[PDB]
Structure formats: structure tokens, C-alpha cells
Model the fold of this input.
Amino acid sequence: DHELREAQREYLDFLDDDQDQGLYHGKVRDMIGSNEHRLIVNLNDVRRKNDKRANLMLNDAFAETIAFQRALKDLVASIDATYAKQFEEFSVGFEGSFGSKHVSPRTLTASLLGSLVCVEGIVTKCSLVRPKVMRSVHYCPATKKTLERKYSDLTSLEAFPSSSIYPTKDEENNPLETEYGLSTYKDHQTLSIQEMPEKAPAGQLPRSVDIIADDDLVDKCKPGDRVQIVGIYRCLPSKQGGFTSGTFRTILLANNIKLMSK
Amino acid sequence: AKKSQLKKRFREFLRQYRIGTDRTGFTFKYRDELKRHYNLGEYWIEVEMEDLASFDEDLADYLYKQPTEHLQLLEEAAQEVADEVTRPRPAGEETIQEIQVMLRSDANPANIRSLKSEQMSHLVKIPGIIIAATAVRAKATKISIQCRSCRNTIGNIAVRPGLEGYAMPRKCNCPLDPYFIIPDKCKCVDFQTLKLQESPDAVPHGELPRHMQLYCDRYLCDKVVPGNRVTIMGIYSIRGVGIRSSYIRVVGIQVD
Amino acid sequence: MDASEVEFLAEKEQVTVIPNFSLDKVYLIGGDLGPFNPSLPVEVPLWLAINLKQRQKCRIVPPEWMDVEKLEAIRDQERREETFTPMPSPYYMELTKLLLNHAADNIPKADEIRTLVKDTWDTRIAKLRLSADSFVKGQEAHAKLDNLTLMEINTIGTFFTESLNHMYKLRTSLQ
Amino acid sequence: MFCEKAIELIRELQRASDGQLPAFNEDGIRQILEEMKALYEQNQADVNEAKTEGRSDLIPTIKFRHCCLLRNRRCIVAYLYDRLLRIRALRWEYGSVLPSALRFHMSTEEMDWFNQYKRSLATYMRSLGGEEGLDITQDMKPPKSLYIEVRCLRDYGEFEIDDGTTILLKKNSQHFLPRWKCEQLIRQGVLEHVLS
Amino acid sequence: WEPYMPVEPGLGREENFLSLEDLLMSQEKLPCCIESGFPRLGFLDKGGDSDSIPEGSKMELPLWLAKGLYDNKRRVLSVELPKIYREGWRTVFSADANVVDLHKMGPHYYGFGSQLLNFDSPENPEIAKTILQTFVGRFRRIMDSSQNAYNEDTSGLVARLDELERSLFRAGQRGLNAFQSWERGKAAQITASNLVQNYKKR
Ligand SMILES: [Zn+2]
Done:
């Protein structure tokens, strides 16, 4: 896509802050040295250097996030090829001032879907950290061939329902064996945020929003904490048999979890 | 078709209704209100029912008995009129937003215990007191589907308003039922459900009050909290053997 | 400048009336009033026509531009050009309001005339709002408002000028 | 610190934005004057001490007290001018003769200023054109008709016209008088314009 | 024809001597440091026991006093910017200007911000730019709110506007009501002024 290419070029130019004050060039080096794969990008700097990208990211988070991640991957590959080879895809987290996107679970309406928001509340429940499958590497003893496959689901960006998980037969029905040590797995956790009890109107029950954490964002907060989650807001379509009720639930993907009280 | 004629008649009603006498002056009431609301950012209008009857009695009579299609046509006419009144919009706002029409009338209110089964799919006006409410969930209006195998896309599918779904296609046009809803390509609106209780005086002796489920959408959400006396105008509709649950699609609220 | 004063400037246009009384020439300070012969046209200023019609002594003849076809053509032209367009009269709104409110039994098809004038007015007002927004956004210092009538200026005046004054004061302060 | 009374006096005026000339505040002005006099005496004493005995450290205190005195003068000047502005409109609204209610809230000097303003205005009116001049106060709206229907709102005795005949102004009575004779009465609040 | 015409406030770096609003804006306090001590003025500081204010103390003097005692030599007084005008709040304002509450931030935001330019500082070119961009960004919503609001309680729309924007709102509302009253044929009545009716209420 031409628009995606332009966004990638502009983001790669923004990240390579070398001949300017070396802020985000130093940050990438620090991330590589500390063996991480997520960079916290303050969007005040993006707004100061390129306002159009800042506004477009605040209003269309999906494509801009993808472009920013690919630009970060290219910059890391430029800095050190082996480190870029270790990790399939890098992640980007945001912070700063968002403007009208500073919402609460009560003022998070359905017109903000697909927009990068920053929700304030208090945690109420957290689930257990179970793994999830991303890539599985199979092997055929008969033909001495190593097969590979990629998976995806509806609770991730670039969502796609993928089936035929863990194949067991080749094209000619040859037996296939799964090598667990060569596959790639990632964590998964689900939380819930509630509007602050002091700022809730009397009589009415407080509101809530369900968020999804993954990879290094798991086990970052416990129930009873004042947090500030930042991420994209999206709907989860629900299909029952051959029918769809039309009343989809809403989820909030997360890319930066910050405590407040600390 | 007759749908186009009805839409044109609704547009003429919106563009040509005037109030006042020649001794003082005339002011168009709904065109000015549409312009003002659209410029303010509120995309709704409150159309009375005696005005529509005075302009065209047949049009009012087709709204008291077949509210669904006629209300949809009225909303489309309101959208077109609002688009033509503010035609040179500032840069970035070229696309025209959808307008929601709310109804109001001065008729004598009915009772919850007087709702027969003959008055199904008819506009009704029932008072009561709100005793419950739910969280504001999301309801889809435009959806796009995609095949799992051949990734064919069928976009801009419309979903009927109210508690009514959309039966997904079976043939791919690729096994049976290969279509899934694309998450990001969906337009959603607000959505809430209430519970209306019969008034404390209309309840007969030695009997507990009855209830009725309500449905609220878009700008009607978060308007009534539990414990308020309201007068509801809505469409009686359905959501044992052959038994179907019945709710009320609310199209107007007058908090007392 | 209130709307009453803008009307006061629109009550001096020329319209044709057909009197029923008889009167000789009147020498007014602003001109000579034609001989008043019953069942004979005589052009008079709009204020005199309004007074005579209110006193049941004349019969107002509609102006030439007050026709359905001409007004439809004007409305279609206005909704086509980006900038403003010339109008059949510099006081079309005041003339339409006064004539259609004080003498409607003489003018035929008054309702469609009033419906078309309103559409043209709405389009011109929207264009004016766009002009004001673009002026403030771009921090300009001059704008060419051609073919714009006095009432449409009065609609937004005393708000545009004061906003521009404050913006100019905030725009050159370090200098 | 200082200037508190002056700022309170200014706030009192600012509260009543829509004209409505309030009662004159004399005690506040007296206290401000006393504070100014005390500041001036202390400042002069400090100036002499720094002049003869060589105390260069007292200059900032002198600057401080001078600034306080300037602020105190500014507040009083603004307070007087705003009351003058409010008083002026009474000449253009309540005819020429001021009602006793408004006069009771006016100071003597303000009353003298009002009388002098009225005399100057009358002289300017007469200076315009020949014979009696053109009264600028009247004709404050575009004219539309010669005779207007009016209705009384209170008893005002009898109102006389140039013909030598008075009209008994009783509440809830209507007369079809010419416009140029009733505009001042309408603006004062004694009549109400009745439209068809 | 407005009968009472008070002196308008002067926007920019210059005030009006007879303006009441400018006489209240300068009353607002501003952080200051006493570079050279004020002898015999220690009675101003209630906590301080000495009769003379010591050198190096910090006080929140009013704007008029700071303007009067200021000198480019900076030997009698130094001025520190309020919190609202430093970089931290300037970036927030640059984010989005329609979400802030310029009635609680300061009743006179533009005027006080312009008056801050009298005191020399290396950040004036940024303060002026921030003020100008805030006005430019908040103009459109003020215009739309003022023009398109007929017969409706406006207390909810003017609760987050400072005094200059409130005056602009009043101008827009009086420019709309005049046209609406003209179209309805109520502009042909000779009516008493508001001042006369208010006096009659008393
Ligand atoms: Zn297919």
C-alpha cells in the first residue's frame, strides 16, 4: 500500500534521530542492550516533529501501529542484524498527552472504536498466565523434511481465524511429528478495569472494560491498583451457529500499562 | 416504487412546514432545527405527530400503524434535508452523518395491562417508572464478511435495528459457512436495555405490579436512571409452543 | 447595525402599484411622485407601497424576478459556483419578506417563492461560515467578499470583526 | 498588604454590571485617603533619613510605597469615572428630570456634573439649525408609521398635547395617538406599544 | 443602542487606566523573589519576626507591584512564570485546546499571558505562540456554540470559557437573537431599555 509505504518512510525517518539530538537512537540501543522487544514512544515528540502522523495515529491506530512496528524492525536490523533475527516482530508502546482520548470506563462510548485511547481506573480481577501458540515447526520422519506454519486469532491485530492447527499428515499422508522445542509460544492474560469508586455517580453501578495483555505486559498489576492503560479499542464479533445476534462485546487491546500510585 | 414517493413526501414535509401567521411572521421549524443541531454536533431531531398529521394526514396514519419502514424513510429524508441545508461543509466533514428522528405526541397515554396482542407492530404510548438498567453495550449496524478459504469480501451489509440479527450466507459464491465477520470493518452504536414497571396507581388491588422490557439506542442511552417516572413512545414488537418474548423499541422519552 | 436599520435601507427600492384613488403629482424631497390615476401603474418607493397596501388603497404588482422559474435558475446557479453569485436585488430577503407578508393575495405562488429564497439564503450563509472559518484558520489579512448582500453580513458581523481584532492583537505583540 | 479597600470598592461596582448606579461609598474613600497619607508621611521620613544620614538601602522601600500610592490613585480615578459613565445614561433614558429614587443615590458633586452636562447638551441641541434645534434624544428607532396604538400601564395623571387638551392616563386604557408624541413615554415605561 | 458603555479592557501588553477588568486582572498574584531586601517592610510578612524582609526571600506579589518594581537590571525583583505557562502545560495545550477549562486555569488567560511578556525572559517567543495557537484552535467551537443555540440554557456552554471568550459568546448570541426576532416580526415594537426595567424591578 502506498499510504503504508509513506507512513513507514516517515516513521523510519522519525526513529533515526541520529544527526539531531540522539534520543530515539539511544533508546533503541538501550532496548537492544537490555534484551527487550518493546519501545515506549512518547507521541509528544511525534506531534512536535510530524503533527499529521500524530493525529492520524490517534484516529486510525491499526495501520499506523503496523507501519511503526515495521519501521522499528528495520532500524533494529540496521543497528544489529542478529538481534533482529532473534525476534520475529517488535512492539511499540505509547505515552504522553492524548487530548480528547483521555477517557474513563464510563465515557468510553462506541464512537471511539479503532482509536488509541488511555483509560484510567482500578483493577478488579486478573486471570492466569497461560501460553498461546504463534508458530509451530513440524517434522516428517519419512522424508526428513521440516514443515512450518503460522497461526492467528481474532484477539490480535491483523485478525484472522486460523484453523487446521497442528497438522499431522503430509501431502502424501506421511506421518508428521511436532517439535515442541522449536515452536514459538507467548503468554496471555485478561484483566478488568473499573471506574474509580469516588468518581462514580450514586445509585448507578460502576462501569467496566475488559483488556487483553500479552508478552511482557503480563503480571504488571494486581487487583486493587490504580492503573492507566493505553491501547486500541475494538469489538469482538460473536457468531452462534449460522446466526449473529449483532450485540458484539467490546475489548481493549493494550500496549502500555502504567501504575499511578506506585 | 411507492417507497420513493413516500420518501419524497417526507422530504417535502421537512422542507415546507412553517409556523406562524402573516400578522407576525413565518419561521420554518424543522429545517432550521436540523441545521442548528447538525452544526452543534447533535445529530437528532424531535418531530411531533400532530404537525405531520396537519401537513399530511395519510403520512401520519402510516406512522401509527407501520412504524418500521415509515420511520426508516423519515430518517433517510431527514439525512438528505440536513445534507442539503449545510451543503458547503468545512474541509474534512464532506461525509454526511446519519440523523435519528424522535417522535412525540399529545395523545392520552395507554396502560401496560391494556396492551393487547392486536396492537403488535404499532406505535404505543405507555407510562411507567424505571426500576432497572444495564451497561451500555455495542450494537452493529454495518458489517463486512470475508470467506475463510478464498478470502472473498462482501461489504456494507446492513443489519436491522432492534434485537434482530443477520443470518449469514451458506454458499461461498470453501466449505459450508466459510464467512467470518471482519472485526475492524464494523460500525457500531450505543445500546441499552431497561425495565419499565406499571405505575403505582394503575396496579389493581391485591396484585403485584407488572413489568416490560425496553430498548434504547444512540442518543436515547443514558437518559433515564432507575427511579424516574417516564412516558415512553415505542414500537411494540417480539424478539412453551410458539411463545415469543415481546419488547418495546423506544423512539421517544419524556422524563417527568 | 441592527436588522431594523438594514430593513430601513431596503424600504427605498422601486415597486409598481395600481392605485384606486386619484391624486396629482407629489413633489417629494427625494423625487417626483407620478400622477395617481386609478387602474394605472405608478412606481413608488417600497415604504409607500407597504403603507398604501396596509391602508387598502393600492394593489402591489410583483417584481420581475419573483418568478418560480427564475428563482429555480438562481438557486441552481448558487449551488454550483464555489464563490458568491450576483443576486437579482441587493435586498432580496427583505423584499421577499415584506411583500409576501403584507400582500400575498396579489402575488401568486407565494409559498414556492418563499421556499426557494430560503434555500438560496441557506446556501449563501453556509458559504459565509466557510469563509470565516478559512479566514481565521489561515491567519490571513484580507478577503474578497464579492456579491454579498448587507443582511448576510449583518448575520455574522460584530462577531467576525471583534474576533479578528483580538486575533490581530494576539498576533503582533512581540513586535 | 495594601490596596485591599480599593479593590473591594472596584469589585462592588463590577458586581452590578447592568448600570444600576449604587449608593456612594464614602467610608472606603476616607480609609484609602488615610492610608495614602500615612504612606506618604512614612515615605517622606524614610527619604529624609536616607538623604541626610546616608542610608542607601531605603530606596526599594520608597519605590514600593510610591507604587502603592499610584495604585491607590488609579483605583479612585476609575471608580469615579465609572459612576460618571453610569450617571450619563440617565439623561438619555429618563428624560430630563431625574426621578427622586435615582437622585437619592447620587452625590452633590455628581448632581452638579449632571446639571452642567444637561445644560451643555441643551445648548448644543439649540445650536443645531435655525430656531429650535433638532432634538437628538428623540427618534431613536427607524420610523414605520405615523399613528401607533398604545396602552397605559400605570396612572400618570393627565398628559397634554400641543393642541391644549390633556388625556387622562388611567391603567388599562388605549389611545390612537401619533408616534412622535408617545415615544418618550413608551421608553420611560408609562406606555406599551400594542401591535395588531 | 446600548445606554451604558463601560471602558473596554485593553488586550495585549498594554492595559487601560480606566478599565475595571484590567484593574482586577493585575490583582492576580505572581511568583517573585526579593533580590535586594526591603528594610522596614518585614511587617508585611506575618511569619517573619524581623522588621525588615531579608535578602533572597520569595513572595507571591501582585502583578501591578511586580510591574512597578521590575527593572531590566534585575536588582530589586525577579519574576518566575506561573505553572500554567511553563513547558509542561504548554505541551498539554498544544495537544488539544478544546478540552481544557480556561475558567479555572485563570479567569483572564489571554490577558495575563500577554502581560507576562513585559518581564523579559528567554521563553517569551514560545508563550506568545502558545497563546495565539490556543485562541486559533478554540475559535471554531466558540463560533458554532454561539451561532447555533436558540432558546436553550447556555450555562453549560460558557462554563469552560474565560472572559474574552464569554464576551465573544455574548456577541454571537446577540447577533443571532436579533435576526430571529426580525424574522418573527417582533423587531417593530418600541420597547423600553433593559436598564429602565431593571430599575423598575427595585
Ligand atoms: Zn471462499
Remarks:
- The longest helix of chain A spans residues 61-79.
- Helices of chain A lie at 2-15, 24-33, 43-49, 51-59, 61-79, 81-86.
